[PDB]
Design a protein around this ligand. Structure first.
Ligand SMILES: *[C@H](O)[C@H](CO)[C@H]1C[C@H](S[C@H]2CN[C@@H](C(=O)N(C)C)C2)C(C(=O)O)=N1
Length: 239
C-alpha cells in the first residue's frame, strides 16, 4: 500500500512517471512525479482501443477482416504481414490503424471522439496521425477512467463491440488473475511519453484499472513499462 516503495521503483529506473489506480471510482496516485496524473500527453498507441471501438461500432471493419500488407517498408519487421484488427492491436501496428482511421474519416472520427469526450477531444485535420503528434491529448487520470469504463462495458458503444475490443487486450492470465492493457510509446515527440493502460480482473471478478505514464528515452527496453507496472501491482497486493 506504500506509496514510498513505488516511489523508489520510479526513482531507480531514472524516469519520471505516475501510476494511477482506479478501484470502484476510487483514484489513487503512485510513482515519483504525481503531477503527471493531471497533465495532457499524446495518447500514442493507447488510442487504438478507441479507434477499434469506433471502427467496429460503425462497421468500417470487423474482427475477421485481414488487413493486406502491400509491400511498403514498415518500422518493425513484425508489422510486415497481413493481419487482423486484433493482431494489429497486439503488435501496436499503427499502419493497420491508420488505414481504419481513413475509412472512418475526419467527420465521423471527430464526432465520436467528442461524443466520448476523450482527453481534449480534438483531432485537427489529418485523420491518420492526430493521436501520435497532436493535437489529441489526454491525462492519465482520463485514461484510467476510459479504460475502467471499457472493463465494465460502460463506454457509449454497443456491448458486443466493447467485448470484441476487450478480447484484443488480454496480456496475461495467471493464477485466476487476468491483466488487460495497451502499451504506448510516443517516440517522435520530446519528451517521449510511455503508456501502459489497462486493468486487473481478480479471481473474484473485481476490476482494478491502472494507467501507467512515464517519460521515455530511446535507450530503454520496451519491457520497462511492464516491469514498473507489475512490481507495483504486486506491492499494492493487486496481484
Ligand atoms: C505505434 O504508434 C506505437 C504505439 O505508441 C508503437 C511503438 C512502440 S514499440 C511496438 C512496436 N511493435 C511492438 C514490438 O515490440 N514488436 C516488434 C512486435 C512494440 C509501441 C509500444 O509497444 O508501446 N507502440
Amino acid at each position: 500500500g506504500h506509496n514510498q516503495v513505488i516511489h523508489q521503483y520510479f526513482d531507480e529506473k531514472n524516469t519520471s512517471g505516475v501510476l494511477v489506480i482506479q478501484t470502484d471510482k476510487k483514484i489513487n496516485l503512485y510513482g515519483n512525479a504525481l503531477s503527471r496524473a493531471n497533465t495532457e500527453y499524446v495518447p500514442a498507441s493507447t488510442f487504438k482501443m478507441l479507434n477499434a471501438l469506433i471502427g467496429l461500432e460503425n462497421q468500417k471493419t470487423d474482427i475477421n477482416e485481414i488487413f493486406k500488407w502491400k509491400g511498403e517498408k514498415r518500422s518493425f519487421t513484425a508489422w510486415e504481414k497481413d493481419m487482423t484488427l486484433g493482431e494489429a492491436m497486439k503488435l501496436s501496428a499503427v499502419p493497420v490503424y491508420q488505414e481504419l482511421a481513413r475509412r472512418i474519416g475526419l467527420d465521423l472520427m471527430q464526432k465520436e471522439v467528442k461524443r466520448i469526450g476523450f482527453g481534449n477531444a480534438e483531432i485537427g485535420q489529418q485523420v491518420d496521425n492526430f493521436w501520435l503528434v497532436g493535437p489529441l491529448k489526454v491525462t492519465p487520470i482520463q485514461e484510467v477512467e476510459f479504460v475502467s469504463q471499457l472493463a465494465h462495458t460502460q463506454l457509449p458503444f454497443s456491448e458486443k463491440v466493447q467485448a470484441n475490443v476487450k478480447n484484443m487486450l488480454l496480456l496475461e492470465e495467471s493464477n485466476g488473475y487476468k491483466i488487460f492493457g495497451k502499451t504506448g510509446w510516443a517516440m517522435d515527440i520530446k519528451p517521449q511519453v510511455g503508456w501502459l493502460t489497462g486493468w486487473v480482473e481478480q479471481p473474484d471478478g473485481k476490476i482494478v484499472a491502472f494507467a501507467l505514464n512515464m517519460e521515455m528515452r530511446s535507450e530503454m527496453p520496451a519491457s520497462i513499462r511492464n516491469e514498473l507496472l507489475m512490481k507495483s501491482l504486486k506491492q499494492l497486493n493487486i496481484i
